[PDB]
Write a protein that binds this ligand. Structure first.
Ligand SMILES: NC(=O)c1ccc[n+]([C@@H]2O[C@H](COP(=O)([O-])OP(=O)(O)OC[C@H]3O[C@@H](n4cnc5c(N)ncnc54)[C@H](O)[C@@H]3O)[C@@H](O)[C@H]2O)c1
Lengths: 302, 302
């Protein structure tokens, strides 16, 4: 009846999201312990050994953590992506891994739109800016976020083209090359896999029309940083804006006036998105222990 | 008859807008004289002395400039507001004064939406932001810009309430007090008149809900600066974003994290808006000297 639920967040939820988490789980007679703003993963290893269930954000969950959590039955990522979790090692420990699809979608999409206007208007500094209206937007991967970005972009009056090798939808091109050729603005929403890693590089970015802008609210490592640096040095009209800051120091030093990155990923860092993702994670934990519910599971074992 | 048209723009139009102005005016057989990037309202005086028509942006057009333009028959403001022009003295000089309604509406509206997101997301810095979706937006003055903002905000999923005595629309309040009580976000789209000068002050801004935000892409003089300073010192949750930077230095010094201003007014600083505003101004001057049409005239004399 009573399960130990550990919440691992180096980047903590807003108070109201923690309260919601506690309200769902404690009413069902569970214990909730928080691990917030931890420095070393040694802190995590200790507090997890006794945990029955886990709630996580973007926190790296690797083999060493997974094995230390010997009685862990479920890990729920409050959000969409699960590249931070070692699925293979979770399969070994017979641990159910799930996410919370679409819960952060509006936070990320609103930031994506805001970044598009910000990038097209020279970072709100002096100079001749451009308007998003009557321009073509390319959505790279169209799931929950890409869908919302599209909705707002149509209200603004942008023409929409979509690339996604896994779905069938309107205005869809089959080649990712065509998207970069046809679209004045690219928004990336691809999850990080072995296939999408370093996929967006020099050969794709170069094909952009005049004043081409890439907005990245997805993952930094789907970009080939070397290729981006190379084309941005060659073409001084290109704009790159991102919620997932690049590692290289080049971008800040060389591309002022056409490059912006947030100091940290703030796409899901809103009061509302924290509540959605935090409470959805707690409810799925609740359902799993109550009814053996494994909806939204991403892995397979035994 | 070949007329001399002078274009007075301290911050110049985009080149394509200048080209579009010349295409309309030189085909009709008129002369176009550019007065770009001057420093004081004294460079204009001698060059306007033999001007027949004038195109102007936000540039200050006082009695001294009007009296010097003794053969000026028409002044067209490429844009919306005409508080920069001394109408009284124009009436005495028997000069027709026009603006170009709605031409730069999208440049401003897009910037306004971008500023709202920017402001609700801690200027794209680290912190807990808020989402515009599901919040109520108060449009203060619902003309060309106001209406276009409404349109975009509706796609974002904001609820809309309107204060504007000159129009009839749904979800409308009759007291400006009501707008500030009921709306989390306020957006100013009022012209600067006798009535609107210093209207938005302490007593109105008081009534905003928690984390109330005001976006001002209109005019700086509609704000009672000392009143705004007072309420913002009192209420640290309040946010003020503006395209029309205030006179007082207090805002930069004290309200870090909840105050954001552009270094210069950039609402109409786009390729697209320059083209629309400039070419309409040229067509309106052309029609005035061709057929004497006075549509869009904002004054009357004799
Ligand atoms: N930042 C920029 O670059 C930029 C660009 C364009 C306009 N502006 C400013 O924003 C204003 C709006 O532009 P617009 O094209 O929508 O003008 P507009 O005339 O189309 O709309 C202004 C609206 O304000 C309403 N209004 C007038 N007096 C009012 C009062 N006393 N109280 C409440 N509402 C009142 C009018 O009914 C009108 O609908 C302009 O007047 C100008 O001052 C700024």
């Amino acid at each position: 009846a009573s399960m130990k639920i550990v919440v691992i967040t180096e980047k903590p939820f807003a108070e109201n999201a923690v309260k919601g988490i506690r309200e769902i789980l404690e009413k069902a007679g569970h214990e909730v312990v928080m691990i917030e703003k931890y420095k070393k993963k040694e802190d995590v290893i200790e507090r997890i050994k006794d945990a029955d269930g886990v709630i996580v954000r973007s926190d790296k969950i690797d083999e060493e953590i997974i094995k230390a959590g010997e009685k862990v039955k479920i890990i729920v990522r409050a959000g969409a992506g699960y590249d931070n979790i070692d699925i293979e090692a979770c399969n070994q420990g017979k641990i159910v891994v799930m996410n919370t699809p679409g819960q952060n979608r509006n936070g990320v999409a609103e930031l994506c739109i805001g970044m598009m206007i910000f990038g097209f208007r020279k970072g709100f500094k002096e100079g001749k800016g451009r308007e998003l209206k009557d321009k073509t937007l390319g959505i790279c991967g169209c799931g929950y976020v890409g869908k919302r970005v599209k909705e707002i972009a149509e209200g603004i009056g942008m023409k929409i083209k979509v690339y996604d090798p896994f779905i069938t939808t309107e205005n869809q091109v089959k080649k990712i090359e065509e998207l970069f050729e046809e679209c004045q603005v690219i928004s990336l929403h691809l999850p990080l896999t072995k296939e999408t890693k370093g996929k967006i590089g020099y050969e794709l970015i170069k094909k952009l029309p005049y004043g081409g802008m890439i907005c990245n609210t997805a993952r930094k490592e789907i970009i080939d940083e070397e290729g981006l640096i190379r084309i941005m040095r060659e073409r001084e009209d290109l704009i790159y804006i991102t919620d997932v800051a690049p590692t290289s120091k080049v971008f800040n030093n060389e591309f002022k006036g056409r490059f912006f990155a947030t100091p940290i990923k703030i796409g899901a860092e809103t009061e509302e998105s924290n509540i959605n993702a935090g409470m959805a994670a707690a409810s799925q934990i609740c359902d799993f222990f109550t009814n053996g519910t494994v909806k939204f599971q991403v892995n397979k074992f035994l």
